[PDB]
Amino acid sequence: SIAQARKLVEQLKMEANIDRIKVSKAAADLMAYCEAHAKEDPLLTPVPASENPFR
Amino acid sequence: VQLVESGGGLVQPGGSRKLSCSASGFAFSSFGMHWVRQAPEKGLEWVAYISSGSGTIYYADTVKGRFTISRDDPKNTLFLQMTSLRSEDTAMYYCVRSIYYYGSSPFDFWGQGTTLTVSDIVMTQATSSVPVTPGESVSISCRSSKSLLHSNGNTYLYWFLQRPGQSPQLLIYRMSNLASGVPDRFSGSGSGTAFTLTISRLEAEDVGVYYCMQHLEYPLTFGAGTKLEL
Amino acid sequence: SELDQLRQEAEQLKNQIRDARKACADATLSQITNNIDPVGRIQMRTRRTLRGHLAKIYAMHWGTDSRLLVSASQDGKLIIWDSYTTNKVHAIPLRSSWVMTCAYAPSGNYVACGGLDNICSIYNLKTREGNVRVSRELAGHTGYLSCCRFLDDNQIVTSSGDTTCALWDIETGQQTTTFTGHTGDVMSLSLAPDTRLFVSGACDASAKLWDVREGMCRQTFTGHESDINAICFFPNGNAFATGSDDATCRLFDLRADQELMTYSHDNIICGITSVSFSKSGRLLLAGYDDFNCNVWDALKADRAGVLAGHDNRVSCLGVTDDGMAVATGSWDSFLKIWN
Amino acid sequence: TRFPFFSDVKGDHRLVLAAVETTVLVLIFAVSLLGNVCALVLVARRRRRGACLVLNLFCADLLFISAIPLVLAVRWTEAWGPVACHLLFYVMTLSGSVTILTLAAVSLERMVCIVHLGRRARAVLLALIWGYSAVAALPLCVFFRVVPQRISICTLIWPTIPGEISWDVSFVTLNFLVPGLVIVISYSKILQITKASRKRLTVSLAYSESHQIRVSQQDFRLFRTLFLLMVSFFIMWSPIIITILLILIQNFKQDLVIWPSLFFWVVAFTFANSALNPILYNMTL
Amino acid sequence: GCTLSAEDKAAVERSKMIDRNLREDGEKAAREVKLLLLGAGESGKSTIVKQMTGIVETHFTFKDLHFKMFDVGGQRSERKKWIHCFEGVTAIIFCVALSDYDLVLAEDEEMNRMHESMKLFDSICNNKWFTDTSIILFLNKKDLFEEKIKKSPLTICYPEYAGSNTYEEAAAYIQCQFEDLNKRKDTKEIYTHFTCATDTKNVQFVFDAVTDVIIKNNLKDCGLF
Ligand SMILES: CCCCC/C=C\C/C=C\CCCCCCCC(=O)O
């Protein structure tokens, strides 16, 4: 009971100590990763039926 | 894994015989079986094949009509019924297991042999001997009548090794895949029609006869054999 | 006054954490992706249909070679498929029919399965005797087993319905680490691409980020309104997407400790059963109780396609490592390869 | 003389009898076609959920009605194209025999399904009943000649009387008596199985008051449906068989037992069987 | 097979043999009668299992008919996350104890035990997965009910009870209260047995109820009804 509460508050206090970046940076990073690998996504870009192994 | 053959011995010519190979240590009912014979001073020669559920049988067209192959699955035994034995059937018949699914080793375990004495694609191994010293790389070449590289990307080349007095052992399957239990010294390569097996560091446990086989189509044909003696 | 004192301490600590992360949301992900060119309309055709299961299909997993599948069904069978020729390579009979999850080893030498018997069974595929044999039975969970993922040939992490996860040593056969902290059943696992962390999604409408080599939770993510059934990582391992029973998917950012985008529509009322990303990370595929899959443009959050063709609920879904196919399984006992 | 099948003087009244004949047959054609196509479409999507020989029935009764029109034309006139006279009766009799045998087979497979608690063999049975019906209706394909005024009337000229009695008493015995016995046996045994189960569960008191009432109110619907299916056969298939035997009898006795317009009305009533088939044997409501 | 290699043909025939074995195994398992054994805490299903961790399976045979019985009482998880696995069982065997009309719940002294069992019955009977699976209802410990009703009135459990305080009427009242929790009175059915003892009464009752369920299922899926 009290030990469980102490464990929970320890976890909550440890989650507060982390450093978090801005959300704009995260969104820009996701956009950059999606852009950099667009050519190698055979579902976003349906590669020709000659290269397709699922004819 | 153990396959023990029996039924050899001297035979009068024109008679009949039956060979039995008993298996122990593997799921016999899920393995196709081949009989492969070898003349007393010649290379290997595929003889017959029976599939997993006995639903597919092939013979080389030199024993067809005279030979029959069968399997007793509950009793875990494989039978070869030979009739009208000529004087050119004197050989040492081996039984070899073969499981075919995507990514399997189809010639991995060879039986021990049965000595019997009676009283298509062409595979070429140019050099029939290699005088070589241990510690230096060795190279063997094999040459096929037609390209083995099937349209699905698989080239069906097998490399076996037979040491003095022992059954052959699968070294390499499909021209590049090294069999389990084989040191990384051996390495298969080549393309389409010409193939090469290379050994980096020779040892005293590598002297013997090397055979190349195709599995593109039946009958399965073996190479003459290159003998490494040292 | 220890009880209420610690209660209010945790209350204020959570409040200040929430305020600190709220003072970090500069702009919505929809505001930065407000000018990108849309994906369009993703049209896919069923290349292969895989038949041979005689009951509902509950799990499915792809080989790292991008060719072989494993599928688990409630007829007590675990089938391995070629998926190029639709050939069955192995058909493994289970000792317990009530399988709820299955996994494929990243090396290809092992498959694992688990379910209502609280046991994770690991099978050896490449045996010299020519059959598939049970190589290990991991027991020690007190609830049903809901997910299992191989780290390597000798490590597996498993979720169970006893509110805990567990990292095992297959060679020894006993737990090496136990992850606790969830207040409800644990329903989904996703391994980071480098397998240094994993993310867990539970019935308490929560997700958590666990360090494998430390055994202790790093971050907790809330935002859903109902139970979470599926979870997956973004291809670079800096984000993950969850699917819950309130007919919403969400994208969470590991670094920002916040959610980025919600994937929901007014015409969808049923919960999500599966979640997966595309190779580039631009398409988010979600399987539904609606009987059909939906493909979302994972940056602008608008449905870019639909995968209809299953006569019952879509229970499992995956995308190959090479990224050229999408397998989809459903309660009508058929798998379908799409491209 | 020679018995005219669909042809008469009609001296009693003009312009109204052909009209009545046209109306009844067009109504029967429309109703049967609509019901059977709806039943085909309906079973086409209960195949996706339940997977019986009920599709062969809906194929056979449509085939039976495709023959309706040629008889309307020969009714509007008194003559006979004397190339279709060799196949119209063939298609009619073949489809009728297929319908009867399909009903008997449906009843038998329902019997075995209930009693016991092969897909290829089902196709073998379907092909077998179709082939047997064809080889049994063949005697009517090359024998109905076009005789002059007993006007070109499509009549039957059997070569030998022993070659006619045998065909008739084998046709009725193997296409009306045997299927009737099969269907009544199958449905009465389904009834006795259900009654035995509901009386095994009554001894031990597995039924409480107000639940022993719904059980009886459902055992009433079951018996009603089975009795309806058992007797609709003999109600909607007996006139054609009795008029076949009566034609046989009057063939060698020469008595005007036939009222001239009796055959056409009997055949129209039998056509209505193809329209009541897909509502009795499809109760998805 | 012409564009296929020798090894591809061998793989194809291996796949066909796998298919043959799968069909042989799945047609054999379609003749098993699967019963989902449910109940509440200390309901009495231990005696029921005696007559005939995770899931507990019990195979047995009675008059050439094979029965699977899955006891699911060892799982404390949320029932809504794994109950759909049992969509398609032949029947649900629910065990009630008639002696609980006076006993209070273990954790909560206020809340009753019979009402908790009734809540569980109403939860599983009107579920969206068991809309058409019959419920064989056993009422155990009837010999400890007539004995305990001499000194204790049933009005403790049901305050609205108005009738004779005898076993033969109180048992009927309990059975009616349990049966009236059904909503789909036409789609599915409930079979009630007042167990406690005898040679082969319980097993034969399950056999009768299961045979009736099978007959009704065949009538439904084979045209009639
Ligand atoms: C069991 C038959 C079912 C099909 C019958 C349906 C419609 C009948 C229509 C044409 C049949 C005419 C031939 C019958 C007369 C037989 C004459 C005889 O031989 O004396």
Strand ranges in E15-152 using DSSP code E only, listed in sequence order: 33-39, 56-61, 66-71, 91-97, 134-140
Question: C-alpha angle B143/B144/B150, rounded to 5°?
Answer: 130
Asked if E21 and C91 come within 8 Å (Cβ–Cβ), the reply is yes
Q: Give the span between the Cα atoms of B30 and E18, in whole angstroms.
A: 10
Distance D239 CA to ligand 1 centre (A): 11
Residue E26 burial (CB < 10 Å; 0-12/13-18/19+)? middle
Tell me if C118 sits within 8 A of C98, measured CB to CB.
no
Who contacts C145 (Cβ-Cβ below 8 Å, separation ≥6)? C100, C101, C114, C115, C116, C117, C118, C119, C120, C158, C159, C160, C161
Domain map (residue ranges) of chain D? 16-281
Who contacts C125 (Cβ-Cβ below 8 Å, separation ≥6)? C80, C90, C108, C109, C110, C111, C132
* DSSP structural state of residue C130: S
Q: Give the span between the Cα atoms of B144 and B223, in whole angstroms.
A: 9
Tell me if B82 sits within 8 A of B21, measured CB to CB.
no
Tell me if C220 sits within 8 A of C239, measured CB to CB.
no
Across D173-185, b (16+ Cβ under 10 Å) vs e yields eebbeebbebbbe
Who contacts B161 (Cβ-Cβ below 8 Å, separation ≥6)? B168, B169, B171, B206, B208, B209, B210, B211
Which of helix, strand or coil describes residue C19? Answer: helix
φ, ψ at B77 (rounded to 5°): -145, 150
Breaks in chain E after residues, C-to-N cutoff 2.5 Å? 52
Who contacts B181 (Cβ-Cβ below 8 Å, separation ≥6)? none
Distances A30 to C22, C23, C235, E125, E222 between C-alpha atoms, Å: 20, 21, 10, 49, 57
Kind of pairing, strands B16-24 and E91-97? unpaired
Domain map (residue ranges) of chain B? 1-119, 120-224
Tokens matching residue E199? 């040679």
Who contacts E14 (Cβ-Cβ below 8 Å, separation ≥6)? B52, B100, B101, C87, C88
Name beta bridge partners: B18: B81
The CATH number of the domain holding residue E160 is 3.40.50.300
Tell me if E176 sits within 8 A of E157, measured CB to CB.
no
The total number of residues written for chain E in this structure: 225
Q: How far is E107 from chain D (nearest CA, A)?
A: 34
Cβ < 6 A, ligand 1 pocket: D 89, 92-93, 96-97, 100, 140, 156, 164, 168, 175-176, 240, 244, 247-248, 251, 267, 270
Who contacts C116 (Cβ-Cβ below 8 Å, separation ≥6)? C96, C98, C100, C144, C145, E54, E55, E75, E82, E85
Type of residue found at C256: A
Asked if E225 and D205 come within 8 Å (Cβ–Cβ), the reply is no
- Chain A residues with beta carbon closer than 8 angstroms to that of C318: none
Tokens matching residue C262? 């919600």
**Is E197 known as a binding-site position?**
yes
The total number of residues written for chain B in this structure: 230
Q: Give the span between the Cα atoms of E38 and E196, in whole angstroms.
A: 18
φ, ψ at C285 (rounded to 5°): -100, 130
Tell me if D68 sits within 8 A of D271, measured CB to CB.
yes
What is the atom index within ligand 1 of the atom nearest the CA of D172? 1
Q: Give the span between the Cα atoms of D251 and B54, in whole angstroms.
A: 65
Type of residue found at C314: V
* DSSP structural state of residue E55: -
Type of residue found at E14: R
- Chain C residues with beta carbon closer than 8 angstroms to that of E28: none
CB pairs < 8 Å spanning B and C: 24
Tokens matching residue D196? 């035995």
Tell me if B30 sits within 8 A of C128, measured CB to CB.
no
Query: Nearest-CA residue of chain C relative to A27?
Result: C29
Q: Give the span between the Cα atoms of E135 and C129, in whole angstroms.
A: 47
Distance D7 CA to ligand 1 centre (A): 16
Kind of pairing, strands E134-140 and E91-97? parallel
Q: Look-up: residue for tokens 């994906």?
A: C39
Type of residue found at E159: P
Range of the domain at E40: 4-225
Which of helix, strand or coil describes residue E31? Answer: helix
Q: Name the CA dihedral angle for D213, D217, D223, D226, rounded to a multiple of 10 degrees.
A: -140
Tell whether E6 lies on the interface with B, counting CB pairs under 8 A. yes
Q: Which of A2, A6, A13, A34 is the best substitution to test chain C (most C C-beta atoms within 10 A)? A: A34
Type of residue found at B146: K
Query: Nearest-CA residue of chain B relative to C132?
Result: B27
What is the atom index within ligand 1 of the atom nearest the CA of D94? 4
**Is E47 known as a binding-site position?**
yes
User: Which chains are adjacent to chain D, needing at least 3 Cβ pairs under 8 Å?
Assistant: E
- Chain C residues with beta carbon closer than 8 angstroms to that of E20: none
Who contacts C248 (Cβ-Cβ below 8 Å, separation ≥6)? C224, C225, C262, C263, C264, C272
With helix as H, strand as E and coil as C, how does chain D read?
CCCCCCCCCCCCCCCCHHHHHHHHHHHHHHHHHHHHHHHHHHHHHHCCCCCCCHHHHHHHHHHHHCCHHHHHHHHHCCCCCCCHHHCHHHHHHHHHHHHHHHHHHHHHHHHHHHHCCCHHHHHHHHHHHHHHHHHHHHHHCCCEEEEECCCEEEEECCCCCHHHHHHHHHHHHHHHHHHHHHHHHHHHHHHHHHHHHHHHHHHCCCCCCCCHHHHHHHHHHHHHHHHHHHHHHHHHHHHHHHHHHHHHHHHHHCCCCCCCCHHHHHHHHHHHHHHHHHHHCCCCC
* Sign of the four-CA dihedral C250, C253, C257, C259: negative
Which of helix, strand or coil describes residue C104? Answer: strand
What is the atom index within ligand 1 of the atom nearest the CA of D171? 1
User: Which chains are adjacent to chain C, needing at least 3 Cβ pairs under 8 Å?
Assistant: A, B, E
The class of domain D16-281 in CATH terms is: mainly alpha
Asked if C74 and E85 come within 8 Å (Cβ–Cβ), the reply is yes
Closest by Cα among D279, D100, D121, D261 to D181: D100
End-to-end CA distance of chain B: 31
**Is E46 known as a binding-site position?**
yes
Distance D155 CA to ligand 1 centre (A): 12
Question: C-alpha angle E192/E196/E199, rounded to 5°?
Answer: 100
Tell me if C115 sits within 8 A of C73, measured CB to CB.
no
The CATH number of the domain holding residue A38 is 4.10.260.10
* Sign of the four-CA dihedral D76, D77, D81, D85: positive
Query: How many other CB atoms are there within 10 angstroms of residue D142's CB atom?
Result: 9
Q: Look-up: residue for tokens 């799982």?
A: E75
Q: Give the span between the Cα atoms of D3 and D50, in whole angstroms.
A: 49
Distance D25 CA to ligand 1 centre (A): 18
CB pairs < 8 Å spanning C and E: 69
Domain map (residue ranges) of chain C? 1-338
Asked if E215 and D113 come within 8 Å (Cβ–Cβ), the reply is no
Question: C-alpha angle E185/E189/E193, rounded to 5°?
Answer: 130
The class of domain C1-338 in CATH terms is: mainly beta
Range of the domain at A43: 2-54
Who contacts C239 (Cβ-Cβ below 8 Å, separation ≥6)? A26, A30, C233, C251, C252, C253, C254, C260
Q: Give the span between the Cα atoms of B202 and D17, in whole angstroms.
A: 108
Name beta bridge partners: C284: C277, C296
Tokens matching residue D254? 């020469």
Which strand (E) or helix (H) includes residue B213?
Answer: strand B208-214
Q: Give the span between the Cα atoms of E41 and E108, in whole angstroms.
A: 13
Q: Look-up: residue for tokens 């029932």?
A: E79
Q: Give the span between the Cα atoms of E11 and E15, in whole angstroms.
A: 6
φ, ψ at E50 (rounded to 5°): -65, -40
Distances E174 to D201, E37, E144, E165 between C-alpha atoms, Å: 20, 20, 15, 12
Facing residue for E75 by CB, picked from C87, C119, C143: C143
Tokens matching residue C332? 């009508």
Q: Count how many domains chain A has.
A: 1
Question: C-alpha angle E62/E63/E67, rounded to 5°?
Answer: 35
In the PDB record, what is the listed experimental method? Answer: cryo-EM
Name beta bridge partners: C174: C169
| C106 preceded by a cis bond (ω within 30 of 0) | no
